[PDB]
Symmetry: C3
Subunit: 442 residues, 3 copies
Amino acid sequence: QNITEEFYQSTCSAVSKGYLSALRTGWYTSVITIELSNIKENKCNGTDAKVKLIKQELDKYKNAVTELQLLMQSTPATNNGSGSAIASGVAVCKVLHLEGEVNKIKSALLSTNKAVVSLSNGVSVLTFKVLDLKNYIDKQLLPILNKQSCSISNIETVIEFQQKNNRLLEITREFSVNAGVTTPVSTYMLTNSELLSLINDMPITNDQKKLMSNNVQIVRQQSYSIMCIIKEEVLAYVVQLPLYGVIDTPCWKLHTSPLCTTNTKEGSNICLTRTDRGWYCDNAGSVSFFPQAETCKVQSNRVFCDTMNSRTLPSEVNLCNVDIFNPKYDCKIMTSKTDVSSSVITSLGAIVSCYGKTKCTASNKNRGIIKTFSNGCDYVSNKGVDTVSVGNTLYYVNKQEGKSLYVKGEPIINFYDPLVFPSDEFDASISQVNEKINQSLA
Amino acid sequence: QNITEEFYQSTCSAVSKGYLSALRTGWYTSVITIELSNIKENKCNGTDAKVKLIKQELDKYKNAVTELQLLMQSTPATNNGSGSAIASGVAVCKVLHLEGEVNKIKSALLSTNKAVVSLSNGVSVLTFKVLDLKNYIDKQLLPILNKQSCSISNIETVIEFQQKNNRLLEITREFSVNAGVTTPVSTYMLTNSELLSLINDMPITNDQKKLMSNNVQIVRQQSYSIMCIIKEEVLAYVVQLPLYGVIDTPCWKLHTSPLCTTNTKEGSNICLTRTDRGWYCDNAGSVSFFPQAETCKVQSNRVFCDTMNSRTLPSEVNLCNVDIFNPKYDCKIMTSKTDVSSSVITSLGAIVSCYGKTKCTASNKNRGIIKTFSNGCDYVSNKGVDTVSVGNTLYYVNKQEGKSLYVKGEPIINFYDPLVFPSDEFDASISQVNEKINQSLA
Amino acid sequence: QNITEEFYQSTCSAVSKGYLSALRTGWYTSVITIELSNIKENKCNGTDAKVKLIKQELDKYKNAVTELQLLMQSTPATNNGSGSAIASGVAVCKVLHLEGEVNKIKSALLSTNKAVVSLSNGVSVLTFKVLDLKNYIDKQLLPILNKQSCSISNIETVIEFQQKNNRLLEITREFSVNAGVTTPVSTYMLTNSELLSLINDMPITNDQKKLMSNNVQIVRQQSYSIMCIIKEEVLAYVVQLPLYGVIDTPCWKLHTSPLCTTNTKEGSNICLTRTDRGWYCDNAGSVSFFPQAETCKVQSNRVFCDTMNSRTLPSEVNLCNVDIFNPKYDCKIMTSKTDVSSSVITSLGAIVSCYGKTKCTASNKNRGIIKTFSNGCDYVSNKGVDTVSVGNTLYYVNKQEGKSLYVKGEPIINFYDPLVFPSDEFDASISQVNEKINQSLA
Ligand SMILES: *[C@@H]1O[C@H](CO)[C@@H](O)[C@H](O)[C@H]1NC(C)=O
Ligand SMILES: *[C@@H]1O[C@H](CO)[C@@H](O)[C@H](O)[C@H]1NC(C)=O
Ligand SMILES: *[C@@H]1O[C@H](CO)[C@@H](O)[C@H](O)[C@H]1NC(C)=O
């Protein structure tokens, strides 16, 4: 719960410590079924207002099935889509193409509406029947059609049919514009009462059940819904839920900013920037790194990340935060001559890289300007500061409370000779730059 | 309203002038409230068709509140989400967690349904009550439930309840699949009559009211809707509207394209390309630059950009369009050996970089091919041209009318010696390349 | 239908052959019309429950038109949006601003509801009237309003009006939050029965009709819906369909992975990686290349790509797969010192780049670990393998069946001297690296 932050003046970088991990290492597949009714193209002789409304609402049921059958003919239910994140779901999606797998799940749900199943591929899958639309249609709609003259029943049956058919039409619509795969999983795909009941019945520890139940919105955002088949009066689609195998290991986020020589110009000042910024978490003796910010979602002091878009780095990678010149790890930097001003809003403050004739200030909402940044790379904590201005750009500082630490140190950009410094390294390293200088010093 | 364009043959770049600015420099927060009714889990003894429909439609009201309460437990309403664009909205979202802030806005809306409020944090916020669902439920639905036997009233009350509850269910659905933050702000979050009435009552000049009212769709696309609380029979969510503090200052868009030596090969021809293409606008003595094309939205001759994703550059940056070798500003270029053909559709024409054995032509819809591009970097105005073909790729030229200017000049790629030219500079500059040549000339 | 794959050990790259092309080279524009009724602000004297529901449902019709008129005032219907993919649609969208173009399409649809038209710009466009809402309103809703006292008719007219108005409200909502351009084209914009009937009546060969009809979901994902006008009781919007002019030409996908020297360190090992990975297809004597993976969609063994985001390359570009040192084409590589482990899931297997102390294995679901990768770049086919682990990251192998070919060869990284190797080339080439070595060897 304690959040702390350290700013390294020598490297123009900051690290936000104190977070807890929640890394997804596996998937859990569950089949959601909707009992449907196969109908003949029945038609009535007369055009009655109470019957024409049923005629129109039945067409929505007929068109939604036709649309889902078109989604069944296209990816990812067939062929492409196996080397991605929905691989575990497609495996179950492909099993249901076998017979009588649809009969195996239909027979286990006619008595409870919700049960476990064992498929022929040997995966114990929880099956849900969230809508028994066949039971409703065959009991109150099919006999009235069948007469060859249809009844003029009360119109409340028409409204009851729209409510039963409403959830089916939304699922079809969500699948139709998302190529049969939706994420996050909407409440129409799986309601809150169904998702919570699904979490409580998963082969997981009691600790992981509380974790997922207290962050159901995060679970939805990291889940997938995959359309499968319409076979034998059963509409089945797989919901792929995340399994967090790494919990409560320490995480930290690295913030970087350009570090340049301070001159005003109109001239030549060299720069360097630490690379590989993002989220780092300890994971099985190594360190998992997440470069893309879209993969990690921060809730309170816990970080939910997906290990599919991660890189495994040795634990010595944390040495770049304490000593960038260490030999145990080759810390990576990029170089340039772009002396443009910018600011990075960290967790407990803001890094400000002010260069040229740019006006960089940190202001208070009531008090006004409380700090004017000189040329270079500086830092200010959120304590008492509300906004940071860099030129014509305004940044709002994160207000979450934590203790900050300003680690004083000489900027490492002053250790290099500009006449020999490689000022255009896209993805270099400290040892790569120092040896590139030794060659030019001949 | 006049749009002009200049093509610089020396640098293989173009500039589209004549635009007006509309840069967002601030946010305006307003609270939208929905009066709700806290209910007991009341149940009836009998199952009546006219009552069961109310039973089902009431469950949607009960599930939508439960879903929004789950969104209230997750970000950005708590902790994370303060260093982003919704910072001003989260500040008001956090204030409503205090008491009796919910009672302060509920008391000011029972008489008008729409009023200003002064929160404890000292921000004058406009509050709207767009739906008084409590008044409807407690007057026509609660007494019928309460009997311990429920009435068989007319079914028009059921349809009236679905219309009142329809807007609440859509807001919950839009929030549930967007982590409680939606953009653009949909008409269900804020209708056209409500948004226009909101713009007319904002502390802004009469000039800015006409600007926002004549571009309400652009305002929606640059606005945010943030879910906050469900506390004491009131559902409150903040709508964050943009404030354009820079209006009618001149803007221009820089288009670039690779400039290579003309040889056919199968061989070694060097190339260079101007960097930092995008939108430039004058802003407070400096120039705001917008590299990402997603930040600026062009409507008629006015450019709507967000200064959060901008860089403040000195006014001398425009010298790269008139003299790329000027000493007052270090113009940036990148180099490569990739002699691949490409085309850039500008505002009033198209830049064509034709290299190798590629067939580059500009055609007319009725006439046919009217220009065959030779090897090099050329330009053609939209006057009489409808399409541009580069190899197997077809580009459609923008048809908007403007005067074009072809600035003849020797391509600067011919000034360099290929045997000494650095042909792999990711992000270099003119002075950085000329000094990199002086070192190799030893 | 045959899918094969070749892995080149010398270049740490793979190619997936056997695919068929479906490249989009043109657009087809069609106008979809909705007959509307212009009304006066009629009001009734009494507040009747059967009439108030019509009062409320009519407000949705009045607000949806006002919202679409606001979308008509903004882009892309006016000015900006011509240099993009919707250029062909905007051309027809602009023609309908002329008179009496709206009268020309309204007169051709009062008798069939579906017909071809010839606009003044000379484009034969198919026009559809998918909803005659004017006929319904003026026949059953206007006379009841007109009385100055409105009738207490049966409430089934209210439900029939919500069904007729439902499709109009969804189109307005989809346009309002997408700036008047939606993609994919939803079923509400164009139903399956309407889209199939549209494909059958297009000026295309019988071969292209079967191709589009068997992949209607892919056609929807590559189509655009553009809002145009609300003029003279007619709501018109253009649906832009793709035209595939390149069919059944061979395609292949290039997969690359870093190739480094094998040392454990903590030290200096040089690396190189083949660039320009993605989809390649033969197209008119040349080769179309698609770098972005979002442009190509793979269905079965056919690849649907958009030539707008492609590059035309000579046919000799395939020589980098058989001989990277060939002089006929200058193959491009990038260099670095980043010895981080990673894996690339190909079509019929997986490339594994294992470096350092990283644990890289390929496992079977039932059997367990079946291959332990040594340091270097290796490959394994999907035959018998289900997952691949690289450090703390788990990859699922594509299970589609094909024959794989392991092309043995010495890694080309061993041919270079590390003391003279340029280890930071962002976008270089083989001939560019060998000449960069000749300069340093002086
Ligand atoms: C952690 O937080 C607690 C607050 O209960 C505080 O007392 C303690 O000093 C903190 N420890 C740190 C910041 O190291
Ligand atoms: C600006 O546009 C007007 C059109 O009213 C034209 O007369 C004038 O010459 C234009 N000025 C330019 C292009 O500098
Ligand atoms: C192509 O597939 C057929 C399967 O019918 C097979 O018999 C043939 O050997 C394959 N040809 C190849 C892989 O070259």
